[PDB]
Amino acid sequence: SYLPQELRDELEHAAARIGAVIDAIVQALTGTLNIGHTIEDLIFSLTNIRPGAVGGVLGGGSIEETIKRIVDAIVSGIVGVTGIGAGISDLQSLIEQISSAAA
Amino acid sequence: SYLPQELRDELEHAAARIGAVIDAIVQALTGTLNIGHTIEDLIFSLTNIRPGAVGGVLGGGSIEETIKRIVDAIVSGIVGVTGIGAGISDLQSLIEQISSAAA
Amino acid sequence: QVEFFEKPVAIPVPAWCDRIDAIVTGKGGEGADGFLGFYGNPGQPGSVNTVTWTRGEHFSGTTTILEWDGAELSIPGFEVSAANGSNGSGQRPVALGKPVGKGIEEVEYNGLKLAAGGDQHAYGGAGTKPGGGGNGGHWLGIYTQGGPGGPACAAVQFRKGALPGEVVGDGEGDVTPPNVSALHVDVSATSTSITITPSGA
Amino acid sequence: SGLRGYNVYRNGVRQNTSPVTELGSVTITGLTPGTDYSSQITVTAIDMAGNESEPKTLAELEAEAATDELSPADPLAPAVRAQIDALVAAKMKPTSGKEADGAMVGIETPTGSYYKAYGGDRTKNQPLFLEQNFRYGSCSKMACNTLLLREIDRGHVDWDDTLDQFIDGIPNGDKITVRYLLLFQDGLKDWLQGDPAVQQTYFLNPTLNYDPLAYIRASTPVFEPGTDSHYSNAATLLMGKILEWCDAEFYTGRSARELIVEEWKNTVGMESLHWPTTNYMNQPYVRGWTPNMALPQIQAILGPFAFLAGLLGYPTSKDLEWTAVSTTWSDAAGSLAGNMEDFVKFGKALYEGEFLSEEMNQLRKEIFTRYVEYEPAGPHQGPGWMGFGLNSICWGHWLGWVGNLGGYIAVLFYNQDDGSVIATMLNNFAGHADAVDLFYQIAYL
Incomplete structure (x- = not known):
């Protein structure tokens, strides 16, 4: 009469569902294959989110692919052949060489 | 027999742990230093995630460092001296000058 | 005329070219894995070596080729390379702060300049092109493993005419260790440690 | 071409992590005392191109790389040590209803000293050892208050000066004087010694970050300043604000985190002393523990x-590790860390009145306000009275503090007449009565 069965059956798991929700967040954001994470790991996860977990733009599946396509397209347009695996140092180098020839 | 000690000692904190999880999410995503956040503060946090919380690409620690490095590198290739604090207005201005000299 | 190499290639030296200037970078080191309450140490950045090769003295005729093997830059009868950065050894406690994978600086030589590879701040992130140190790892998920080192690169300039005050070199890059005959050290101690301050080379 | 820096190798292993600079430094650590290492340590310069000299051994540099001789501490008599060891055993986990996995005790007297570690911290094959760091907790209040007393000695603050001169927006900042901070006559509410909504967050989420100054600026005072004396964390925090103001108007600008560690680490030789900015403290450390509790x-x-309480409850199923905690929960209270030898040096420097004039060092031993009257539960418990001084809590002829932060309880007291120091440390949160009771028993022995 004080604590009904339909409440008692939910309380059976409520404490464990909070741990399951913490483990679900840490796995999605950091890629752990473990169980029993802490609120410290939750804070680490939510302050170091994978760029693979954020949806992309302009054709990218992720924000990692989106930025890589943008950098690769500038570098591919300057070098004149389609390619992959460029960096931000290539971007500065190749634009410095085109700016010089334009001047 | 109905509600064991090993359950009762977990139920002791279950309601508080949900509030601690809300407080942890809001702090990570907005940078508050408070306690006792609501599910409204939680929706605000999850719809306004800091770009400092999302890990970067191509050397950036965050997506904020990644985008700043890309824009600063293009402008530093055009102007020739390595620099920082470029904007998207510089990016359009300085690319229009190269385009004119190249034509 | 400037070319950048980051994959094995060979190209002919131009007819007009009185000399070739080159900057060459080592591969970066791989970062160490973290553990629990310990990060990995990041790998060190590749070394940077520079050379000028002059026509008549080092190369002649129209048969010449400039050949980059992926870690050494070469012409018939001469070659230049830079030492690979040391791998990350062991672990760093959390209280000493997040590992940073250091990049190669803005090196400049005879009016050819190599863009600075930025530092890598991502946990276990790959080293930046050129030659950057692979960052040290954390211990959760995809952040556990250390990053691979930044790949080796060359920047090469085909040039005409002398520069102000230039004198033709031996045709090697730098092959010489620092002069340690005047190296000096200050030492201090406790009951369980020794502190070294080296100087003067 | 160009020097990149220097690499130091010991026995062929590079002790350096990244090239040392032309007047930089590297520390080689875990060396055995007294031994010569001038044949083990070797130095090499490197160029930007990666060229490396063959190593020069420190003997060839004529450098005296021998480690210092071990300091000969004059020991306590073995009949006293046997009794101290029996006293500590009566507080640790093998005894019925005690939760402490391990303990440290640091005793110093005119008739000798004894530093010991006991038990463990749940690492597999590693019992406690005296090189390990622990949380000093609210013993940090003695470090904070003392620098304010030095600052009063310099006339940079007078006793009657009020909070509005140093910080904006504190409740009753017009009526709190500096004397009322030092003596805990500020009426301010406490965020860890009160407020169960805050306390649950501290226990359940200790790595969270907190603004306790914002809590003060929101709070309603418990009493008008000067009408009572009651224990305050807000007081020591606002002393940190007065000291940050001093480093702006005099000296050179610092935070309280910086100024409190610089002065004590440089003056008292406390080489381990630090204030953690991460959730963890420096290596190696004692792990801290708690029962799961209501x-x-x-x-x-x-x-x-x-510490008076009969904390014999909570026959719980399981324990939580409590090593990780944010120092923002305590700020100028709570936050210092270091090892047992440095914690006993801190007690010696508080006895000797370091930082203070001969006039302050008299005044400091004599002005007091009530903390708690009590009935002694046994013969080793002292006068039935304790009081807050200008930089300590008194218990009979002893001056000191009792504190915790997370899984660690630490106690530090010195005898005002004799100059003897007793430090005690328990690595379980349940130990808050036991470590203080242990101090009373060593003092009574």
């Missing part, structure tokens, strides 16, 4: 009179 039992341990 909110009514957390309130009993975090309360102002907690």
